Curated annotation (Swiss-Prot), chain A:
Domain remark from Swiss-Prot or TrEMBL: The basic N-terminus is not necessary for binding to 5S rRNA. It is however required for cooperative binding of L5 and L18 to 5S rRNA as well as for binding of the 5S rRNA/L5/L18 complex to the 23S rRNA.
Gene: rplR
Highest taxon, organism lineage: Bacteria
Protein name: Large ribosomal subunit protein uL18
Record keywords, A-Z: Phosphoprotein, Ribonucleoprotein, Ribosomal protein, RNA-binding, rRNA-binding
Swiss-Prot record, chain B:
PANTHER family reported for this sequence: LARGE RIBOSOMAL SUBUNIT PROTEIN BL27M (PTHR15893:SF0), RIBOSOMAL PROTEIN L27 (PTHR15893)
CC terms in the record's Gene Ontology section: cytoplasm; cytosolic large ribosomal subunit
UniProt source species: Escherichia coli (strain K12)
GO molecular function: ribosome binding; rRNA binding; structural constituent of ribosome; tRNA binding
Family: Belongs to the bacterial ribosomal protein bL27 family.
Phylogenetic placement of the source organism: Bacteria, Pseudomonadati, Pseudomonadota, Gammaproteobacteria, Enterobacterales
Keywords, sorted A to Z: Ribonucleoprotein, Ribosomal protein, RNA-binding, rRNA-binding, tRNA-binding
InterPro entries with a match to the protein in the record: Ribosomal_bL27 (IPR001684), Ribosomal_bL27_CS (IPR018261)
GO biological process, one term: cytoplasmic translation
Region (Disordered) residue spans: 1-19
Description of how the protein assembles with itself and partners: Part of the 50S ribosomal subunit. Cross-links to the 23S rRNA. Cross-links to the A and P site tRNAs.
Domain of life of the source: Bacteria
Transmembrane segments: none
Protein's name according to its UniProt entry: Large ribosomal subunit protein bL27
Curated annotation (Swiss-Prot), chain C:
Name of the coding gene: rplP
GO BP of this protein: cytoplasmic translation; ribosomal large subunit assembly
Official protein name in the record: Large ribosomal subunit protein uL16
PANTHER family recorded: 50S/60S RIBOSOMAL PROTEIN L16, LARGE RIBOSOMAL SUBUNIT PROTEIN UL16M
InterPro entries noted in UniProt: Ribosomal_uL16, Ribosomal_uL16_bact-type, Ribosomal_uL16_CS, Ribosomal_uL16_dom, Ribosomal_uL16_sf
Pfam families: Ribosomal_L16
Quaternary structure, from the entry: Part of the 50S ribosomal subunit. Cross-links to the A and P site tRNAs. Interacts with assembly factor DarP(YjgA).
A GO CC term assigned to this protein in UniProt: cytosolic large ribosomal subunit
Length: 113, 84, 131
RNA sequence: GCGGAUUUAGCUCAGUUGGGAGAGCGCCAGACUGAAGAUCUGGAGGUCCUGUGUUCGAUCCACAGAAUUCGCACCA
RNA sequence: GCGGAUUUAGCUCAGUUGGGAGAGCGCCAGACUGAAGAUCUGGAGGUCCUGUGUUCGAUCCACAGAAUUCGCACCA
RNA sequence: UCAAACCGGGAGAUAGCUGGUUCUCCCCGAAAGCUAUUUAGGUAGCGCCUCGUGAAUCAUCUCCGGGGGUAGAGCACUGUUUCGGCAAGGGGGUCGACUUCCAACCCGAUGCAAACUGCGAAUACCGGAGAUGUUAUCACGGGAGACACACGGCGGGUGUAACGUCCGUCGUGAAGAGGGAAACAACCCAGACCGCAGCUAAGGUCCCAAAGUCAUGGUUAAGUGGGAAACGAUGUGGGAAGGCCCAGACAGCCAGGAUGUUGGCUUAGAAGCAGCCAUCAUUUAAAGAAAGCGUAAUAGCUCACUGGUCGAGUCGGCCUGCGCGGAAGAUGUACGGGGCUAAACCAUGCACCGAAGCUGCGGCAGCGACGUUAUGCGUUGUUGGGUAGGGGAGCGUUCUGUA
RNA sequence: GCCCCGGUAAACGGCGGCCGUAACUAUAACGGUCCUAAGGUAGCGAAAUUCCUUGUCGGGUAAGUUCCGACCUGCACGAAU
RNA sequence: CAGUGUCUGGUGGGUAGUUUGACUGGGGCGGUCUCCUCCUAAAGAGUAACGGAGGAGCACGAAGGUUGGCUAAUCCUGGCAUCAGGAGGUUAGUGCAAUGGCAUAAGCCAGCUUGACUGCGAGCGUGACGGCGCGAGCAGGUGCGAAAGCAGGUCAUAGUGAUCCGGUGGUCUGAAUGGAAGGGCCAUCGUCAACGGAAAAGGUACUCCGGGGAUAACAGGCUGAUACCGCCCAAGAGUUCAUAUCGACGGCGGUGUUUGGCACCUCGAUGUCGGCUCAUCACAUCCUGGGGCUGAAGUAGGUCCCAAGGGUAUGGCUGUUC
RNA sequence: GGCGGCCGUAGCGCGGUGGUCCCACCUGACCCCAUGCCGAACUCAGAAGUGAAACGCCGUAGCGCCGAUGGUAGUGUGGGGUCUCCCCAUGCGAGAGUAGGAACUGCC
């Protein structure tokens, strides 16, 4: 078969769909950072939390740094464990290393994922 | 060096390909069929090729690619006996 | 005879050519021939040149089918040399109901006498059609 | 008809790392000689069989055609 | 495969004193001849197979590799 | 006796070379590929005959789940190739506009292909389930023949060609009766126990000849009854379509068919009528400066057109059925004969003769099933052609046992 | 003994092609140019040894691929093959 | 010197054998016998011929792997080398004869790096059959990557070959012991490219025998391209005038006397050409006779049909047939 | 614009219109970080100016693709004649033609 438009952009991952589990997409914005736990077959979002929502707790500083990306990971993951999910793979479509995505992943494990 | 004299292919021998893998009985995770080498994707029964369709069935065993862009090269999604 | 062309070797030239008549207006007349047959370029010239040499009154005479199927021959012994292109040049394939020569003309037929002269040159019983 | 060889500047011929067209002789001229000769030097002289195809570019590849030559075949 | 010889300036070759690279021919020039020839004189032309090692320094030692040639071996 | 002695001797030399190879009956009944072999008209493991053992459930004639892409078709690689329109380039003539020619591109109509395609079979074919079948399929092992099919027709491929090599379809020689087709390997129909009865098939059914000179309808007339062709034909029959038709036409018969002009040009000459261009005008009911014949050139004779008379079917054209022209040669000529208007032939149909066919009465074999120790009987399904070859029974025979 | 060089062809042998001059035309004759060194002058030569060749000219005959004489580039004739 | 005995190397027709394969439009000459990849093979499979087209017998540490960036041909514009912009699934390129695959790519550029690891099984090649190859696991471990994952060389299908012997890597092995020389299991490398594979060439008219049509040179038969003849259309020549002789181009046929010639018939053999001599059975003819066309005015001729009724009776060179 | 469902008729082109809620452009590069030569890439920051390239809606069906109603040629298959060849029975029907879909649907 040919390479779908998505495969050409290599943003997706078929190797994580062969397992039949969930993902941990990490959206990044020059103002905010977002994370989700979408499941196969469309865009089924079970749990998610934005850095802007972190303010609801008691956030003061900017929401576009590293320490903020780690705070969101603990929130999205905490809510995930409350849902019923245990395992999850990391899905960072295009990005560098040691960036905010790594801090997001390291935060997810800190919760229990 | 370069090629010349336009034409189709270039004549060979007798086709060496079969169709092993009943995929309705016991099936160890291995190449189900034989025609063209190199190809992956299908981990179970995924017989799906342009036309009236394709199919296979029953056999609990992780992974099980096909031959290549031939008898249903597409990769479906899981399948086993009925209660392994 | 499996239809043929070239993509092989260059043979003789066209004994035909002169389409004749003016093509500023496309008509829908003709001279159908009941029966399939292969006509060589030469015989096509004799028939075409026959009517054209008679329709001096006017023109608008045209032909749709042309020879595009070569045919080789072989003179002498045999054992080395598929076939060469000799007298047997291109040949046209005519269908049981195909229109060959059509002249753009309203009921004033002065070429029926011309088509008749040509109808006696091609190996096939042709018939005159008004439509 | 078949196969092999050959088909480069007037003549006789070299030239496959595909990317320089060259040698001997001849012709013209210079030089020299009283001068002519002969050397010697210089120049001119080549659709490098033909067309097409292939390559960034082929005399030097592939295909087709033509000519020459040889062997063979044919010849009440 | 094994062994011997050979592998110096275009060509044919000398050169083991390890410390000069040279000769003949050829090429160019000079002298000469009216001139050309041939002598004769002069000049140019050498990664002296390649690398490494040995020595102060080696074409001329040792080792390794390559070329050429011959004998031999193989050539189901 | 010598391009090499005779005799005997170690030869009943070695051969992938030829020939040879003899009694009866019963059952079944071929093939011409692969790997290897000092092997290729030889075996072994295997495609095929037969027998014993072993295992086990399909197989395929079907259906169902896959793989291929040929024929054909479409329109397609490539290399040719038809026309028109549009845009760009080059060359020539006159104006920087246009006209003409050539090559490449696109579109529509046209289309092209031994090496293609927007589409697309039949069909063969891998794996798994069924009606059918239940023990077939399939797994093992032993003993073989074996890897030199060909020919005719049709369609081919290679082939410049020989009583081919090599594929495809069909059909036979193979393993086929009987039978007609006049005779006949294959065309049509249909398949062999015995004796016998009936009814059908092949074919035939007027006579020899056994069976209706049978039924309905039609054609041909040619005796065609069978070679026959590219080509011609008011021989004849049938059908559709245009125009002219009874307020005197379309065709016959009678008479006109003219004047400038022997139109110009050209031509030895052409004065309607070689050819080259025009083709107007005149008198007027009609008469083309003339459609043909004719002359060396004129002349002459018709037609077109009009009048009278004639008073009726006529004229141009398309298609279909059958026969025909294209056809001269061999000691006596005809369908098997007689001969038949059907005792032919064509389109159908019916009854019979006619096979060892089919059915019925008295007498079989092989295989499988049931019961059985039984391959002995009884019953049941299939019942019975055969070369090469396989298997089995049998009797003629000699001598020596025991009765 | 042989490689080495040389002698020896009464050693096995090799002797193709081209231009010019010159002729009414073709050839022979002479020199060169090239290839492989020479390329053939005595005689005699298509002769039982030349294909092409019934070669060319001619005798002879009504005519003779026969024969004889000459020329002769000598396909694959030529020296005690 | 010798004579001579024995042995080794070289030279050595002076002497003896077709042993040196096959296919093949008889044979010979010319072309082909290993292997890969269209068409032919007629939609699986498999499938031939001196069947039409074209190649492999090696090359390479990189044309290996991974990652980042990038994306091509070709055409147009401004300046064929370059650079900037636009169009552009891609026709580029990807080692190799072709098909198939691929572009935010297996393509290009750059950097980095190097899994061409060891051991052992299951599966794949209708129908049993080895070496070899490939797809897919497991156990222990090398490289790169974050990791999954990717490798058993270069995208896949040609680039290869036994036994004996020799040269190379651990062990085992011969009255009794030491020192040596010798004898195997697995694997790699070296040659056979007339390439499943011999160490190396040739005539044969004195012929014989055992066989076979599975072997040609003739006659017959098929075909008829060639050959002979006719027909259709008809340019043109003919002072003018196609059609009154001649008659091109092209098309359509007949005969089979000619020739080339597809091997079922005969080579377990109908000995060869022509002539000669002798017997038997027929017709596509020159004159004469009767006719058709006429470049037939007349005359004289040209061509064609018919006709055997009569007559075809002779020499020189050559064996020769025309 | 947010938030869902259905979930390849959402391939690919093309038109109108709206929200300063939202969003790319744009703007600025002090720093984290980064380009072999180029903060273009990469990464960070602020928001002057638009909608010229998203998104929300909504209008054409070109072309790709997926379905539906109608039918000639072609073709599967078994008997008939006939010089070749053609015909009949029966299952379908080239390819052309007429139409369907450019989203659909809930909530703030």
């Amino acid at each position: 078969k040919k390479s779908a438009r998505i495969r050409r952009a290599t943003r997706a991952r078929r190797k994580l769909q062969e397992l039949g589990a969930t993902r941990l997409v990490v959206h990044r914005t020059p103002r905010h950072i977002y994370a989700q736990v979408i499941a196969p077959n469309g865009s089924e979002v079970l749990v998610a939390a934005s850095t802007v929502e972190k303010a609801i707790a008691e956030q003061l500083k900017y929401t576009g740094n590293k320490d903020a990306a780690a705070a969101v990971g603990k929130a999205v993951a905490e809510r995930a464990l409350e849902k019923g999910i245990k395992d999850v793979s990391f899905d960072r479509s295009g990005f560098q290393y040691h960036g905010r995505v790594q801090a997001l992943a390291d935060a997810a494990r800190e919760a229990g994922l | 060096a370069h090629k010349k004299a336009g034409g189709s292919t270039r004549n060979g021998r007798d086709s060496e390909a079969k169709r092993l893998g009943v995929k309705r009985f016991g099936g160890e995770s291995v190449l189900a069929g034989s025609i063209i080498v190199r190809q992956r994707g299908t981990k179970f029964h995924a017989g799906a090729n342009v036309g009236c369709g394709r199919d296979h069935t029953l056999f609990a065993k992780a992974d099980g690619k096909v031959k290549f862009e031939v008898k249903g090269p597409k990769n479906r999604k899981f399948i086993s006996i009925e209660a392994e | 005879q499996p239809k043929r062309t070239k993509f092989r070797k260059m043979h003789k030239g066209r004994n035909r050519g002169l389409a004749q008549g003016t093509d500023v207006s496309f008509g829908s007349f003709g001279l159908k021939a009941v029966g399939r047959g292969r006509l060589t370029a030469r015989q096509i010239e004799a028939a075409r040149r026959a009517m054209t040499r008679a329709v001096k009154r006017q023109g608008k005479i045209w032909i749709r089918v042309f020879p595009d199927k070569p045919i080789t021959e072989k003179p002498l012994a045999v054992r080395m040399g598929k076939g060469k292109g000799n007298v047997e040049y291109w040949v046209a394939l005519i269908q049981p109901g195909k229109v060959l020569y059509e002249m753009d003309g309203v009921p004033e037929e002065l070429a029926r006498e011309a088509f008749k002269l040509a109808a006696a040159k091609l190996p096939i019983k042709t018939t005159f059609v008004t439509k």
